[model samples]
Target: VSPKTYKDADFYVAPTQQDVNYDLVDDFGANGNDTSDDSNALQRAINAISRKPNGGTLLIPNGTYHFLGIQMKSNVHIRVESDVIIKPTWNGDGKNHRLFEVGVNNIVRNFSFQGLGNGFLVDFKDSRDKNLAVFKLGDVRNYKISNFTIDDNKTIFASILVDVTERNGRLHWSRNGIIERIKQNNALFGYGLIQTYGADNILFRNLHSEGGIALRMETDNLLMKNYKQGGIRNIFADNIRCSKGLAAVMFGPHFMKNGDVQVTNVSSVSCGSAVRSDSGFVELFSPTDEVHTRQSWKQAVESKLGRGCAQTPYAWAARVTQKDACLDKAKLEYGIEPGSFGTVKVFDVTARFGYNADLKQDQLDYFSTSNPMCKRVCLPTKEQWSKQGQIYIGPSLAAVIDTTPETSKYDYDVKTFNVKRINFPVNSHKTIDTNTESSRVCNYYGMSECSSSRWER
Candidate 1:
């Protein structure tokens, strides 16, 4: 679905058209200028449409609607006009209050979010708590949030957050979601994209972040033990433009081949690091324009931990523009230690530093120079490479190679186990069977519109 824009998403999701209007004079009477608590009115309008049979669209026209916070339900389409501003009430302690919280099968698009809190875009107050994200989602499916700008007024703290849980034997992740055209401006820590418990088939495209990390794919071993939890799957990000941030991109172990992921077409300028794939197989491809002349003296792409149990633990690129003098600076810094227990495939698309030739050397002792797999992996032909423009490698990040062969089908094994226990003395006493347990905490921080943000249902 590369070129297919979701222009018909409205009809695609619901053919029957239903619209609820939010104006100065209406059933849910809301006034802009007066600092009156129109939060209830806005809530009333959304609630009416939320219960509709066809899932009507609650339209908020161009106005600054004052709100403390709002929660969304299923089958509710919120289409705020581009001229609209959603301002949250600046309670002294707004950490407990998030501007927006949403449930499954929802579409919230084309709106601007600002607040009077005088804190960071996604913050509670003077102290910006990482837990206090501006927006949140839980157990949502088929959700699409797009075309929104967060002018944090520099008070907004963090970006949209996705929280999940481990269900049954595996993680029951929120699936089939899309977030596109999200821009964060004038903020301390611009935004972060996180799905802690698990998420699948989530595509984030055309995301712009300034003044902080553009996108973060992180895993907190918090609240998880006695099990392998929260692996990434089918999460793709493209056309990410980051300016003036500590890290343009960051990730954890979930991004490897075990998770099946792809990342491409990223452009970052004057950031700390262009891309830091700390662990796993995150297929990062860079055409010339994508990572051209990006400033990161530290390391353009740091593979702190290469593919962990991945079919091919490698990074590949074509038409890369190596920054001047950073010429000596290793663009790709590998943290792979020799005498390591496992094996990894390292493929470097290389030409001489300034030779104006497209010559990729496979650093593997098995593969000979001028390997044809280089072309199949990343079109590194002479004219094609020059056409692609200058590519560079430096220091230890120098020309190590791993290109998955076209014939190699990545079919790893899957195994299942069964356990049985017998007690001969069981006749003396009754026994328990199919026992189950769960853990939950009170929403003491008041982070949800529901009774509590408990993990167990």
Candidate 2:
């Protein structure tokens, strides 16, 4: 379900005039690019305010600043002026080498960090090995990043990893925050612009990303060597725009638990899937793209409901079951319970398959499983379907289902099932051949030889 509509949350307040303190220059920090070490000078400023109970803002005036690791503390605002540019030393001592690190209740905004790289890293295998970013928030809550741009320049390292791991024999996680208006020029190598593992209750909005995926939500808890107990859930993403990447949104290889994400208004151009979560509740809506026809629609309805990769979407909805690691060969290895999934709802959207005609095996199994708790999805009443005719539904891996009349000129290539005329009961059963891999075999819904017809149960 969509969260309660929020007016700007008053959760974290900003610092005041008297609290607006700590100029980087006063501590002998050079503003211009230089060979001299400015790292210590900047560190001293952050170190000074961190000791005080009332933390203040660190003012970075308009200039190009080079530094090593930048450590942040709570109640601090690292305010960079409009013209300031910060770049990290790519080659430095292994210790204390990240661009910037932040703690709880801190704000970082209005600056640009530029990295030097080709469209990708010199080596694709070094992404996880490299800790590169304009900012890396570690186990901090109530943090906000707004009004900034990160020019990765196709760098080999991760831009932002909202990561949760074990510390001192305990779990450390970050949640309850907003990341908005953060633009990226060119793609970073791995995990999109922002990657969150086991983080929750966050909102991402108004992001303009090019080169790579916009966001990736991963929760691989089962394979945890030491970092036990973590999952991605209750995170909302909206108004996300991406271009020239593998995908606009991607999800887990093993999404263990707590996975209900509400995504809306995320569009991309010339990418892979707009969204992909093989198992989980993904409430998607109106994710349209005015571009890309030939390179489109891998699994547009694989998650639940979406608008377009190139054309227009009518509407869609799904009741995705509670997804545990499917009880497979190594059951104890994944350590996840089965038959539990999440809920999904889509409206005013589009539902179609890409060049791939038939739904995957797992998707087909879930669609017709006995006693399943799924629902039928339809949009634009038959009257509206004729009057509007903007809805385009076809090109499934199997036969297509059309709710509009077959005679309608707007009806595209196929119309095997017309929901308007044939009131197929949602509880209808079918005796189908579960074995054959041929597209001509027997199945239910939109698959092969039902001899008559089939419906979702």
Candidate 3:
């Protein structure tokens, strides 16, 4: 079946199966109440369901189940009861492992791993493996994962990872997936509740993260083997909340092009920033050695040329176009840049601070020192602003630095439209005056007439 719009009423629904087609995990000798490993029995049940002519649901009844890892198959939906608790069983190998993986061996389609009620818990706090993910999806299509609580702390990876994998000498991208109503306890700085690299047409709704970024949409060419052609795009996120994390939403298009992102109704409490747009960085990818480390590449360039030559924007161009001439001239050349975003639209975003008591003083000091203005919606730096396409900001309530004509240095451009700065005291509940006289609307070149009534109170 083809993918449907995310706005469809039944878009998040999984495929239906008759009651007779439901296979219980207990029938396959998987004891959920015991402390033993259930990976093999669960895999056997999944294998049986995959072999059926019509795919069926493997129901995991109410109990605590232990697993090392489980591979998912096409058309085999796994459903868990409300009281179900899933924990990882260490094999003493001390290697990283994922709870659920799809499309690692081949492309899979039309499956849903969902919880029956809100109490389903995937607890990873006691596991020795610090690097773990609840779901590692690759090259999957038409999938849904919803209504589960992930209890973790300081995990290196996101709870749900949307990525690509290779099959038969070809790389594939995951598309058309829905992840909604998921809650995560704590995540690391770079990683978050969800991170997508090469996926498309994905929807994230009603997500809450206590720590770390709630939604991290970014791309990495070096990690993905220089596969920069099909980057992440067509994303829709709504009603996201984060507390004591790095940010609520972050857009980091590193060494790739991201397209058409729309986010609405974001709430950030005591976080570093509400919405953050990251600048692109340069990296060298080699086909022979297949090693791309930022420090190593910088060392190679600086050793051959001189200091500060590798830091220039023209370094990329010089390396690509004039490899020999650039070295002889001792100057970096110019080439195509990496990491750009297209047509971003953010609406109804708000940020507040000083609410979470568990926030460390060091974290608060770092944010205050780095971002003195406490910008709720942080854009890319002025130099890299031109790389992004038209950006639209609509009806946001935030505490930010005042950007008046006297305070603003750079002229606003048409590329970023309808950016209004209303200064409110930090941690104050007072509403700002949205009147034209009190509000400063920074439109293109000169101050254009803005309708203050369009602002939400």
Report the number of the highest-TM-score candidate.
Answer: 3
Q: Rank the candidates by lDDT, best first.
A: 3, 2, 1
Backbone clashes in each candidate structure, one number apiece?
Answer: 16, 13, 5
Candidate 3 differs from the real structure by a C-alpha RMSD in angstroms, to one decimal, of 11.6
Task: List the candidate 1 regions with Cα displacement exceeding 4 Å.
Answer: 1-25, 93-95, 104-132, 153-157, 165-173, 189-197, 224-229, 254-258, 280-457
Provide the lowest-lDDT 10-residue window in model 2. 412-421
Per-residue lDDT for 1-457 in model 2, tens only?
3334554453233444334477787655565656354677787787676666666667766666666667766666666666666666556454434567764234432122222222111122223324456566656766676666766645544566676645666666666777766767655424457777666677777776665557766554322323445666667666665554434555543324445665665454433223444332222223354432322332343322222211222233222222222122123442333211143221111222222111223333323432233222122234322422222111122111112112422121211111111122343221112231322222333322211111110
Candidate structures ordered by TM-score, highest first: 3, 2, 1
1-457: candidate 3 lDDT, tens digit per residue: 1122456333344666522246456578778778888899888887788777667888889988898678888788888899999998776666768878888676678878888966599988777787788888887888888898888866678888887786676668778878889888866545779887787888889998876678887677354634435677778888887776656777776556667777777777665546665554444433345564546666666666556546522212223222333333342332434456677766666676532312211122223322344333222223422422122111123322211122222111102222222243444322221121222223222222213321110
Local distance difference test scores for all models: 0.41, 0.45, 0.61
Better candidate number, 1 or 3, judged by TM-score: 3
Residue 381 of model 2 has an lDDT of: 34
Give candidate 2 misplaced runs (Cα > 4 Å): 1-3, 15-20, 35-37, 92-97, 103-131, 221-225, 253-255, 280-329, 333-457
Candidate 1 lDDT, tens digit per residue, 1-457? Answer: 1222333342123324554544433556777556455667777776776666655555555565666567666666656555555555656653565667754224432222222222122223333332344566655676776666665433434567655544455443356676767667544532443333356667767777754556666543333322444445656566665554434444544222325444445544433333443322222333445543322211334323221211221233311112222212222332111110012111111111111111122221111222212221222234322322122111111111112212223222211112121221122111111121212211212222211111001
